Design a protein around this ligand. Structure first.
Ligand SMILES: NC(=O)c1ccc[n+]([C@@H]2O[C@H](COP(=O)([O-])OP(=O)(O)OC[C@H]3O[C@@H](n4cnc5c(N)ncnc54)[C@H](OP(=O)(O)O)[C@@H]3O)[C@@H](O)[C@H]2O)c1
Lengths: 190, 207
Protein backbone atom coordinates (compact mmCIF):
# COMPACT_ATOMS: atom_id res chain seq x y z
CA UNK A 1 0.00 0.00 0.00
CA UNK A 2 0.89 3.73 -0.13
CA UNK A 3 2.47 5.16 3.08
CA UNK A 4 2.91 8.98 3.30
CA UNK A 5 5.47 10.32 5.81
CA UNK A 6 5.54 14.08 6.75
CA UNK A 7 8.98 14.75 8.19
CA UNK A 8 12.25 13.62 6.58
CA UNK A 9 14.15 13.64 9.89
CA UNK A 10 15.32 10.80 12.07
CA UNK A 11 11.95 9.33 12.94
CA UNK A 12 10.48 9.76 9.50
CA UNK A 13 13.43 7.98 7.97
CA UNK A 14 13.46 5.19 10.60
CA UNK A 15 9.72 4.63 10.31
CA UNK A 16 9.84 4.70 6.53
CA UNK A 17 12.72 2.17 6.55
CA UNK A 18 10.45 -0.39 8.20
CA UNK A 19 7.51 0.16 5.84
CA UNK A 20 9.95 -0.17 2.88
CA UNK A 21 11.30 -3.46 4.34
CA UNK A 22 7.69 -4.65 4.62
CA UNK A 23 7.29 -3.99 0.82
CA UNK A 24 5.37 -0.72 0.78
CA UNK A 25 5.78 2.35 -1.29
CA UNK A 26 6.83 5.20 1.07
CA UNK A 27 6.64 8.85 0.07
CA UNK A 28 8.37 11.53 2.13
CA UNK A 29 7.56 15.26 2.43
CA UNK A 30 9.71 17.69 4.36
CA UNK A 31 8.92 21.16 5.65
CA UNK A 32 9.52 22.82 2.24
CA UNK A 33 7.63 20.12 0.21
CA UNK A 34 3.92 19.89 -0.75
CA UNK A 35 1.90 16.69 -1.09
CA UNK A 36 -0.57 16.33 -4.00
CA UNK A 37 -2.15 13.12 -2.70
CA UNK A 38 -1.91 11.07 0.53
CA UNK A 39 -1.57 7.35 1.13
CA UNK A 40 -3.87 5.15 3.19
CA UNK A 41 -1.54 5.45 6.21
CA UNK A 42 -0.12 8.92 6.98
CA UNK A 43 2.76 9.31 9.50
CA UNK A 44 2.99 12.75 11.22
CA UNK A 45 6.81 12.56 11.89
CA UNK A 46 7.09 16.20 12.82
CA UNK A 47 7.60 18.18 16.06
CA UNK A 48 4.51 18.59 18.22
CA UNK A 49 4.29 22.41 17.63
CA UNK A 50 4.02 21.68 13.85
CA UNK A 51 1.24 19.05 14.20
CA UNK A 52 -1.93 21.17 14.23
CA UNK A 53 -0.85 23.40 11.34
CA UNK A 54 0.05 20.29 9.28
CA UNK A 55 -3.29 18.63 10.06
CA UNK A 56 -5.04 21.86 8.99
CA UNK A 57 -3.05 22.07 5.75
CA UNK A 58 -4.14 18.56 4.69
CA UNK A 59 -7.58 18.59 6.39
CA UNK A 60 -9.33 17.46 3.23
CA UNK A 61 -6.91 14.74 2.12
CA UNK A 62 -6.70 13.34 5.64
CA UNK A 63 -10.41 12.43 5.71
CA UNK A 64 -10.74 8.63 5.64
CA UNK A 65 -7.04 8.02 6.37
CA UNK A 66 -5.18 6.25 9.17
CA UNK A 67 -3.18 9.18 10.69
CA UNK A 68 -0.29 8.29 13.03
CA UNK A 69 0.81 10.70 15.76
CA UNK A 70 4.33 9.85 16.95
CA UNK A 71 4.88 12.99 19.11
CA UNK A 72 6.25 13.30 22.61
CA UNK A 73 4.69 16.72 23.47
CA UNK A 74 7.30 17.79 26.03
CA UNK A 75 7.77 21.27 27.32
CA UNK A 76 11.31 21.53 25.86
CA UNK A 77 12.07 24.71 27.85
CA UNK A 78 11.64 22.97 31.22
CA UNK A 79 11.68 19.19 30.47
CA UNK A 80 9.38 18.99 33.51
CA UNK A 81 5.94 18.81 31.92
CA UNK A 82 4.07 17.91 28.76
CA UNK A 83 2.29 20.73 26.88
CA UNK A 84 -1.04 18.89 26.52
CA UNK A 85 -3.65 18.47 29.28
CA UNK A 86 -2.74 16.03 32.10
CA UNK A 87 -5.88 13.94 31.36
CA UNK A 88 -5.36 13.95 27.59
CA UNK A 89 -2.80 13.56 24.84
CA UNK A 90 -1.60 15.10 21.57
CA UNK A 91 -3.30 12.16 19.78
CA UNK A 92 -6.66 12.90 21.41
CA UNK A 93 -6.24 16.55 20.31
CA UNK A 94 -5.48 15.40 16.79
CA UNK A 95 -8.48 13.06 16.70
CA UNK A 96 -10.77 16.01 17.64
CA UNK A 97 -9.16 18.10 14.90
CA UNK A 98 -9.51 15.24 12.37
CA UNK A 99 -12.96 13.79 13.10
CA UNK A 100 -13.12 11.89 9.76
CA UNK A 101 -9.68 10.27 10.23
CA UNK A 102 -8.85 7.18 12.43
CA UNK A 103 -5.90 8.62 14.55
CA UNK A 104 -3.36 6.23 16.03
CA UNK A 105 -0.65 6.89 18.61
CA UNK A 106 2.40 4.86 17.58
CA UNK A 107 6.24 4.98 17.62
CA UNK A 108 6.44 7.64 20.38
CA UNK A 109 7.94 5.00 22.75
CA UNK A 110 10.58 3.70 20.28
CA UNK A 111 13.78 5.74 19.92
CA UNK A 112 14.75 6.33 16.24
CA UNK A 113 17.93 4.18 16.37
CA UNK A 114 15.81 1.25 17.59
CA UNK A 115 13.50 1.62 14.58
CA UNK A 116 16.48 1.85 12.14
CA UNK A 117 18.15 -1.21 13.60
CA UNK A 118 14.98 -3.10 14.58
CA UNK A 119 16.50 -3.84 18.03
CA UNK A 120 16.72 -2.16 21.45
CA UNK A 121 20.53 -1.73 21.62
CA UNK A 122 21.13 -5.07 19.92
CA UNK A 123 19.44 -7.03 22.69
CA UNK A 124 15.69 -7.37 22.04
CA UNK A 125 13.41 -6.71 19.06
CA UNK A 126 11.93 -3.21 18.90
CA UNK A 127 8.19 -3.05 19.74
CA UNK A 128 5.64 -0.51 18.57
CA UNK A 129 2.81 0.20 21.02
CA UNK A 130 -0.23 1.38 19.03
CA UNK A 131 -3.25 3.07 20.67
CA UNK A 132 -6.41 4.04 18.72
CA UNK A 133 -10.20 3.79 18.87
CA UNK A 134 -10.82 1.75 15.72
CA UNK A 135 -9.64 -1.85 15.79
CA UNK A 136 -9.74 -2.13 12.00
CA UNK A 137 -7.33 0.86 11.73
CA UNK A 138 -4.98 -0.77 14.27
CA UNK A 139 -5.23 -4.08 12.42
CA UNK A 140 -4.40 -2.45 9.04
CA UNK A 141 -1.45 -0.58 10.57
CA UNK A 142 -0.23 -3.77 12.24
CA UNK A 143 -0.60 -5.71 9.00
CA UNK A 144 1.37 -3.04 7.12
CA UNK A 145 4.38 -3.75 9.44
CA UNK A 146 4.03 -7.59 9.30
CA UNK A 147 7.12 -8.15 7.16
CA UNK A 148 9.26 -5.58 9.03
CA UNK A 149 11.49 -6.60 11.89
CA UNK A 150 9.30 -4.71 14.40
CA UNK A 151 6.93 -6.27 16.89
CA UNK A 152 3.58 -4.48 17.20
CA UNK A 153 1.20 -4.63 20.22
CA UNK A 154 -2.22 -3.07 20.71
CA UNK A 155 -1.95 -0.52 23.54
CA UNK A 156 -5.74 -0.04 23.71
CA UNK A 157 -8.09 2.80 22.83
CA UNK A 158 -6.93 6.32 22.05
CA UNK A 159 -7.42 7.28 25.77
CA UNK A 160 -4.25 5.18 26.33
CA UNK A 161 -2.19 7.73 24.38
CA UNK A 162 -1.91 9.52 27.74
CA UNK A 163 0.00 6.54 29.17
CA UNK A 164 2.07 6.17 25.98
CA UNK A 165 3.07 9.85 26.14
CA UNK A 166 3.98 9.48 29.83
CA UNK A 167 6.19 6.50 28.92
CA UNK A 168 7.88 8.38 26.06
CA UNK A 169 8.58 11.29 28.43
CA UNK A 170 10.06 8.95 31.06
CA UNK A 171 12.19 7.18 28.47
CA UNK A 172 13.60 10.49 27.23
CA UNK A 173 14.41 11.80 30.74
CA UNK A 174 16.22 8.53 31.59
CA UNK A 175 18.31 8.73 28.39
CA UNK A 176 18.96 12.46 28.92
CA UNK A 177 20.35 11.75 32.39
CA UNK A 178 22.66 9.11 30.75
CA UNK A 179 21.27 6.24 32.79
CA UNK A 180 20.28 4.63 29.54
CA UNK A 181 21.45 5.57 26.06
CA UNK A 182 19.53 6.70 23.02
CA UNK A 183 19.95 3.37 21.12
CA UNK A 184 18.31 1.49 24.03
CA UNK A 185 15.18 2.18 26.04
CA UNK A 186 12.20 0.12 27.07
CA UNK A 187 12.14 -3.30 25.46
CA UNK A 188 8.75 -5.04 25.55
CA UNK A 189 9.35 -8.62 26.74
CA UNK A 190 6.62 -11.25 26.60
CA UNK B 1 26.79 -12.06 64.40
CA UNK B 2 23.02 -11.53 64.83
CA UNK B 3 22.31 -9.06 61.95
CA UNK B 4 25.63 -9.32 60.13
CA UNK B 5 25.52 -10.76 56.63
CA UNK B 6 27.50 -11.02 53.40
CA UNK B 7 27.06 -8.25 50.80
CA UNK B 8 27.35 -9.80 47.37
CA UNK B 9 28.28 -6.62 45.37
CA UNK B 10 30.76 -5.35 48.01
CA UNK B 11 33.17 -8.33 47.46
CA UNK B 12 31.01 -10.54 49.70
CA UNK B 13 32.20 -8.48 52.73
CA UNK B 14 30.57 -9.27 56.03
CA UNK B 15 28.88 -6.41 57.83
CA UNK B 16 25.61 -5.22 59.30
CA UNK B 17 22.99 -4.34 56.79
CA UNK B 18 20.02 -2.03 57.05
CA UNK B 19 16.65 -2.57 58.75
CA UNK B 20 13.87 -2.79 56.18
CA UNK B 21 10.15 -2.97 56.99
CA UNK B 22 7.63 -4.17 54.44
CA UNK B 23 3.95 -3.53 54.86
CA UNK B 24 2.03 -6.07 52.74
CA UNK B 25 2.76 -9.80 52.57
CA UNK B 26 1.42 -10.31 49.04
CA UNK B 27 3.21 -11.18 45.84
CA UNK B 28 4.89 -7.74 45.61
CA UNK B 29 5.80 -7.41 49.29
CA UNK B 30 7.37 -10.85 49.30
CA UNK B 31 9.31 -10.26 46.03
CA UNK B 32 10.59 -6.87 47.23
CA UNK B 33 11.60 -8.28 50.61
CA UNK B 34 13.36 -11.15 48.81
CA UNK B 35 15.73 -8.66 47.22
CA UNK B 36 16.49 -6.81 50.43
CA UNK B 37 17.11 -10.24 52.07
CA UNK B 38 19.59 -11.43 49.43
CA UNK B 39 21.29 -8.02 49.61
CA UNK B 40 22.12 -8.83 53.28
CA UNK B 41 19.58 -6.70 55.09
CA UNK B 42 17.20 -7.35 57.97
CA UNK B 43 13.64 -7.53 56.64
CA UNK B 44 10.52 -7.55 58.78
CA UNK B 45 7.04 -8.03 57.23
CA UNK B 46 3.64 -6.83 58.49
CA UNK B 47 0.21 -7.09 56.96
CA UNK B 48 -1.64 -3.74 56.91
CA UNK B 49 -3.67 -4.90 59.99
CA UNK B 50 -0.58 -6.22 61.92
CA UNK B 51 1.12 -4.20 64.61
CA UNK B 52 4.47 -2.82 63.41
CA UNK B 53 6.63 -3.39 66.51
CA UNK B 54 9.73 -2.21 64.67
CA UNK B 55 10.11 0.32 61.79
CA UNK B 56 13.33 0.34 59.78
CA UNK B 57 15.26 2.96 57.83
CA UNK B 58 13.30 2.08 54.67
CA UNK B 59 9.57 1.26 54.91
CA UNK B 60 7.95 -0.36 51.86
CA UNK B 61 4.20 0.14 51.46
CA UNK B 62 3.34 -2.90 49.41
CA UNK B 63 -0.39 -2.56 50.08
CA UNK B 64 -3.40 -1.55 48.02
CA UNK B 65 -3.74 2.18 47.23
CA UNK B 66 -6.64 2.70 49.71
CA UNK B 67 -4.46 1.30 52.53
CA UNK B 68 -1.70 3.89 52.09
CA UNK B 69 -3.38 6.80 53.81
CA UNK B 70 -4.49 4.63 56.77
CA UNK B 71 -0.99 3.23 57.37
CA UNK B 72 0.56 6.66 56.97
CA UNK B 73 -1.91 8.02 59.56
CA UNK B 74 -1.31 5.23 62.07
CA UNK B 75 2.49 5.58 61.97
CA UNK B 76 2.94 9.21 60.86
CA UNK B 77 5.08 10.33 63.84
CA UNK B 78 7.06 7.08 63.73
CA UNK B 79 7.75 7.53 59.97
CA UNK B 80 9.42 10.95 60.46
CA UNK B 81 12.90 10.88 58.95
CA UNK B 82 12.40 7.54 57.24
CA UNK B 83 12.37 6.54 53.55
CA UNK B 84 8.77 5.55 52.68
CA UNK B 85 8.26 3.71 49.39
CA UNK B 86 4.94 3.71 47.51
CA UNK B 87 4.80 0.80 45.05
CA UNK B 88 1.16 1.21 44.05
CA UNK B 89 -0.45 1.18 40.64
CA UNK B 90 -3.62 3.03 41.72
CA UNK B 91 -6.04 1.61 39.16
CA UNK B 92 -9.77 1.92 39.17
CA UNK B 93 -10.21 -1.85 39.39
CA UNK B 94 -13.91 -1.61 38.59
CA UNK B 95 -13.16 -0.26 35.12
CA UNK B 96 -9.46 -1.14 34.51
CA UNK B 97 -9.66 2.07 32.43
CA UNK B 98 -8.62 4.84 34.79
CA UNK B 99 -6.47 5.61 37.79
CA UNK B 100 -8.04 6.75 41.12
CA UNK B 101 -5.66 9.69 41.70
CA UNK B 102 -5.68 13.04 39.88
CA UNK B 103 -4.39 13.12 36.29
CA UNK B 104 -1.70 15.68 37.18
CA UNK B 105 -0.57 13.84 40.32
CA UNK B 106 0.21 10.41 41.81
CA UNK B 107 -0.41 8.31 44.88
CA UNK B 108 3.16 9.00 45.93
CA UNK B 109 2.67 12.82 45.78
CA UNK B 110 -0.41 12.38 48.01
CA UNK B 111 1.62 10.31 50.46
CA UNK B 112 4.40 12.95 50.49
CA UNK B 113 1.81 15.61 51.35
CA UNK B 114 0.53 13.42 54.22
CA UNK B 115 4.04 12.64 55.45
CA UNK B 116 5.95 15.89 55.00
CA UNK B 117 8.83 14.77 57.26
CA UNK B 118 9.28 11.42 55.47
CA UNK B 119 11.31 10.92 52.31
CA UNK B 120 8.68 9.45 49.98
CA UNK B 121 9.86 7.47 46.99
CA UNK B 122 7.96 5.84 44.13
CA UNK B 123 9.59 2.49 43.28
CA UNK B 124 8.76 -1.05 42.08
CA UNK B 125 5.45 -0.15 40.48
CA UNK B 126 6.91 -0.84 37.05
CA UNK B 127 8.40 -4.28 37.99
CA UNK B 128 6.09 -7.31 38.03
CA UNK B 129 6.54 -9.59 41.12
CA UNK B 130 8.04 -12.48 39.10
CA UNK B 131 10.74 -10.23 37.64
CA UNK B 132 11.69 -9.18 41.23
CA UNK B 133 11.75 -12.82 42.40
CA UNK B 134 14.00 -13.95 39.51
CA UNK B 135 15.89 -10.71 39.01
CA UNK B 136 15.19 -10.92 35.27
CA UNK B 137 12.53 -9.86 32.78
CA UNK B 138 11.43 -13.36 31.64
CA UNK B 139 15.04 -14.60 31.71
CA UNK B 140 16.16 -12.12 29.02
CA UNK B 141 17.31 -8.86 30.74
CA UNK B 142 18.05 -7.71 34.30
CA UNK B 143 15.07 -6.26 36.19
CA UNK B 144 15.32 -2.52 36.80
CA UNK B 145 13.75 -0.50 39.56
CA UNK B 146 12.86 3.11 38.58
CA UNK B 147 12.87 5.29 41.65
CA UNK B 148 11.39 8.77 41.80
CA UNK B 149 11.65 11.12 44.81
CA UNK B 150 12.54 14.64 45.85
CA UNK B 151 15.52 13.91 48.13
CA UNK B 152 18.57 12.79 46.21
CA UNK B 153 20.21 11.46 49.40
CA UNK B 154 17.18 9.30 50.12
CA UNK B 155 17.26 7.91 46.55
CA UNK B 156 20.99 7.21 47.00
CA UNK B 157 20.43 5.39 50.32
CA UNK B 158 17.59 3.32 48.79
CA UNK B 159 19.78 2.50 45.77
CA UNK B 160 22.62 1.44 48.13
CA UNK B 161 20.21 -0.89 50.01
CA UNK B 162 19.58 -2.74 46.68
CA UNK B 163 23.22 -2.58 45.43
CA UNK B 164 23.87 -6.12 46.75
CA UNK B 165 20.77 -7.52 45.04
CA UNK B 166 20.48 -8.58 41.35
CA UNK B 167 18.37 -5.56 40.46
CA UNK B 168 19.43 -2.53 38.48
CA UNK B 169 18.23 0.74 39.99
CA UNK B 170 17.83 4.00 38.07
CA UNK B 171 16.87 7.50 39.26
CA UNK B 172 13.57 8.42 37.60
CA UNK B 173 13.69 12.06 38.79
CA UNK B 174 11.82 14.05 41.35
CA UNK B 175 8.59 12.81 42.95
CA UNK B 176 6.51 14.63 40.25
CA UNK B 177 7.77 11.84 37.88
CA UNK B 178 5.64 9.34 39.86
CA UNK B 179 2.82 10.45 37.49
CA UNK B 180 4.73 9.01 34.54
CA UNK B 181 5.79 5.91 36.51
CA UNK B 182 2.14 5.22 37.39
CA UNK B 183 1.18 5.67 33.74
CA UNK B 184 3.87 3.12 32.70
CA UNK B 185 2.79 0.65 35.44
CA UNK B 186 -0.83 0.92 34.25
CA UNK B 187 0.14 0.36 30.65
CA UNK B 188 2.29 -2.66 31.58
CA UNK B 189 -0.65 -4.19 33.51
CA UNK B 190 -3.08 -3.70 30.61
CA UNK B 191 -0.61 -5.35 28.17
CA UNK B 192 -0.38 -8.41 30.51
CA UNK B 193 -4.20 -8.40 30.97
CA UNK B 194 -4.59 -8.56 27.15
CA UNK B 195 -2.07 -11.47 26.94
CA UNK B 196 0.23 -9.52 24.62
CA UNK B 197 2.86 -10.00 27.29
CA UNK B 198 2.86 -12.35 30.31
CA UNK B 199 3.24 -11.57 34.01
CA UNK B 200 6.91 -12.68 34.13
CA UNK B 201 7.90 -10.24 31.34
CA UNK B 202 7.13 -6.55 30.76
CA UNK B 203 9.28 -3.49 30.14
CA UNK B 204 12.99 -4.23 30.29
CA UNK B 205 15.15 -1.11 30.74
CA UNK B 206 18.04 -1.45 28.23
CA UNK B 207 21.07 0.86 28.31
N1 LIG C 1 13.97 10.97 17.71
C1 LIG C 1 13.39 10.01 18.46
O1 LIG C 1 14.15 8.91 18.88
C2 LIG C 1 11.93 10.11 18.87
C3 LIG C 1 11.27 8.99 19.45
C4 LIG C 1 9.88 8.98 19.52
C5 LIG C 1 9.12 10.08 19.05
N2 LIG C 1 9.78 11.16 18.52
C6 LIG C 1 8.96 12.26 17.99
O2 LIG C 1 9.06 12.20 16.57
C7 LIG C 1 8.83 13.47 16.01
C8 LIG C 1 9.95 13.74 15.01
O3 LIG C 1 11.17 13.70 15.71
P1 LIG C 1 12.58 13.48 14.96
O4 LIG C 1 13.57 12.99 15.96
O5 LIG C 1 12.39 12.89 13.66
O6 LIG C 1 12.98 15.02 14.60
P2 LIG C 1 13.78 15.54 13.30
O7 LIG C 1 14.91 14.62 13.09
O8 LIG C 1 14.14 16.99 13.47
O9 LIG C 1 12.65 15.40 12.19
C9 LIG C 1 11.49 16.17 12.24
C10 LIG C 1 11.35 16.72 10.82
O10 LIG C 1 10.03 17.21 10.67
C11 LIG C 1 10.17 18.23 9.69
N3 LIG C 1 8.99 19.10 9.64
C12 LIG C 1 8.63 20.15 10.47
N4 LIG C 1 7.44 20.64 10.05
C13 LIG C 1 7.05 19.90 8.97
C14 LIG C 1 5.94 19.94 8.11
N5 LIG C 1 4.98 20.84 8.32
N6 LIG C 1 5.84 19.04 7.07
C15 LIG C 1 6.79 18.06 6.83
N7 LIG C 1 7.90 18.06 7.67
C16 LIG C 1 8.02 18.94 8.71
C17 LIG C 1 11.48 18.95 9.97
O11 LIG C 1 11.99 19.51 8.79
P3 LIG C 1 13.04 20.74 8.79
O12 LIG C 1 14.33 20.31 9.46
O13 LIG C 1 13.27 21.10 7.33
O14 LIG C 1 12.41 21.87 9.59
C18 LIG C 1 12.36 17.84 10.53
O15 LIG C 1 13.41 17.45 9.65
C19 LIG C 1 8.78 14.42 17.18
O16 LIG C 1 7.46 14.75 17.44
C20 LIG C 1 9.39 13.66 18.35
O17 LIG C 1 8.90 14.03 19.62
C21 LIG C 1 11.16 11.19 18.41
Amino acid sequence: MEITIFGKGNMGQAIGHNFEIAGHEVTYYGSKDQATTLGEIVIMAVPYPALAALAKQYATQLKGKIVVDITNPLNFDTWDDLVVPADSSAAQELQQQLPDSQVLKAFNTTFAATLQSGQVNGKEPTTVLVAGNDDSAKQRFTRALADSPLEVKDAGKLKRARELEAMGFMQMTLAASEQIGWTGGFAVVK
